Design a protein around this ligand. Structure first.
Ligand code: CL
Length: 73
């Protein structure tokens, strides 16, 4: 499980990658087809909220639902 401390201690060039690797499987469970896109959309959020999402399923959902509204016609 990823921690702020773990995140803060990693070289910045890798932080988003670390978050993406953790977020993507969770996002793909909700949406196999829109997963790359949703994940890319979400990595745009500031890291510290991303961590809160990894840690609250409900936060991740609400963020995903709202990513999907961006994607729709
Ligand atoms: Cl889907």
């Amino acid at each position: 499980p990823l921690t702020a401390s773990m995140l803060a201690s990693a070289p910045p060039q890798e932080q988003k990658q670390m978050l993406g690797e953790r977020l993507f499987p969770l996002i793909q469970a909700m949406h196999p087809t829109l997963a790359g896109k949703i994940t890319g959309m979400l990595l745009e959020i500031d890291n510290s909220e991303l961590l809160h999402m990894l840690e609250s399923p409900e936060s991740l959902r609400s963020k995903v639902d709202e990513a999907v509204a961006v994607l729709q016609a």
